Amino acid sequence: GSHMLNRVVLVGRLTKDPELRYTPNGAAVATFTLAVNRTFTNQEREADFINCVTWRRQAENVANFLKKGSLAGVDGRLQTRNYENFVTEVQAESVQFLEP
Amino acid sequence: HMLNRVVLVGRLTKDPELRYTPNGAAVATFTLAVNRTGEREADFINCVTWRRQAENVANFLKKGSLAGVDGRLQTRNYENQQGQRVFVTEVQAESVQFLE
Amino acid sequence: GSHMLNRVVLVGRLTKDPELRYTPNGAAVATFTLAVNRTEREADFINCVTWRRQAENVANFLKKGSLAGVDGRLQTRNYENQQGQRVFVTEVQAESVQFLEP
Amino acid sequence: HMLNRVVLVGRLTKDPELRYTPNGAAVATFTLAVNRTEADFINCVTWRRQAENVANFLKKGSLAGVDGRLQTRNYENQQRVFVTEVQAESVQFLEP
């Protein structure tokens, strides 16, 4: 592929504790959902709920330091896992911990 | 209130769909295939654009055309008629870029 | 004239208190510099500029040491100085400023 | 670390400049003209495989996409010189 860009940057709050597991190849994987407030206001300020996935030390740092309600920033890519009986999620290659 | 930024460059998988709201707001939708580099080879992102940007999409973009998007990631999740939670993730394109 | 994208997103700490000025037409304009840490140089100094309501909020809520997030565009204002040498200016025109300690 | 992400799409103003470091690492610099929504002229830098691709694929006026980070750098002139550049992790361009 030529001329392909895919970049996402989000800051939000985890809706619940992150879920850490390990893949068959032993790679740690931490998942979590990020509530990101919208810019505009309707009628009430709605939010968007974005599923994120992290890998290896990134996933391990997430599991140890981030909890429900923690503020976190992610930098990564949009990835899809559509199947037939669509899924979209953020593959976060960097996670910033905005709280101590 | 919180950071939310998406930038993509890919190629439309089909011709864009255009429609005007009864009040005259143009809304155009399309799906961007973005190639990666055993694992998945590409991702397919649904995009939404409004007003002049949407009229540009409909007049200049077709299946296979190269297009770039700059916007935010939003969700429109809902509960279907069968009590099942359905997840909808889309890119609200604030700016659409294309050749010519 | 077609196919152009310009997007910057940063999180950093203000190295100094923001400076608030007003244009000849009365528009508020606030400037500030962010220290953006890296993963021998430890952080990059990036000059930011904001307008109107965003500038008012920056002036009221952000001070030296405040953590801030910016989303905007890269802009350049290069010129020729008194001695005839070109000097290059790069700054972030922030469309939105997130205050991470309100 | 903190968030620092830049994405640009523009046109090279000049042919890219290919240099090498003492240990043989390729380094390519170029300037992207990005029209405002009048244009901005942003200096970019890339390394190694990406640098080699820039050198033998991009020329004056070529369209190029950049994904990277906003950084500052030091390099003596051929006086101390300080520059603000986009460090490109990936450089995208149109199939030759």
Residues 1-30 in D contacting B (C-alpha not used; CB under 8 Å):
3, 5, 7, 9
Residues 48-87 in D contacting B (C-alpha not used; CB under 8 Å):
65
SS3 A49: strand
Q: Are strands A5-14 and B85-86 parallel, antiparallel or unpaired?
A: unpaired
Rounded-to-integer distance, Cα B33 and Cα A59, Å = 27
CA distance C3 to chain D (A): 7
* Run of H or E residues at D11: strand D4-12
How many domains does one find in chain A? Answer: 1
| C47 in reach of chain A (CB within 8 A) | no
- Which residues on B lie below 8 Å from C71 (Cβ)? 3, 5
- Tell me which chain B residue has its CA closest to the CA of residue C6: B70
Q: 């930038």: which residue's tokens?
A: B7
- Reported resolution, Å: 2.2
With helix as H, strand as E and coil as C, how does chain B read?
CCCEEEEEEEEECCCCEEEECCCCCEEEEEEEEEECCCCCCEEEEEEEEEHHHHHHHHHHCCCCCEEEEEEEEEECCEECCCCCEECCEEEEEEEEEECC
Q: Looking at residue D40, what DSSP letter applies?
A: E
B: neighbours with 3+ CB pairs under 8 Å? Answer: A, C, D
CATH code for position D47? 2.40.50.140
Contact B77 A39 (CB under 8 A): no
Rounded-to-integer distance, Cα A58 and Cα A92, Å = 9
- Tell me which chain D residue has its CA closest to the CA of residue B97: D9
Rounded-to-integer distance, Cα D4 and Cα D88, Å = 12
* Run of H or E residues at A6: strand A5-14
Q: Which of A3, A49, A88 sits opposite B9 (nearest CB)?
A: A3
With helix as H, strand as E and coil as C, how does chain C read?
CCCCEEEEEEEEEECCCCEEEECCCCCEEEEEEEEEECCCCCEEEEEEEEECHHHHHHHHHCCCCCEEEEEEEEEECCEECCCCCEECCEEEEEEEEEECCC
Q: Are strands B26-35 and B4-12 parallel, antiparallel or unpaired?
A: antiparallel
Rounded-to-integer distance, Cα D66 and Cα D83, Å = 18
**CA end-to-end span of chain B:** 35
Q: Which of B2, B70, B100 sits opposite C2 (nearest CB)?
A: B100
Both tokens of D15, joined, read 């042919």
Both tokens of A64, joined, read 């140890």
Q: Looking at residue D54, what DSSP letter applies?
A: H
Cα Dmax for chain C: 46
Cα radius of gyration (chain A): 15
The approach used to solve this structure was X-ray
Residue span of the structural domain in which C87 resides: 1-102
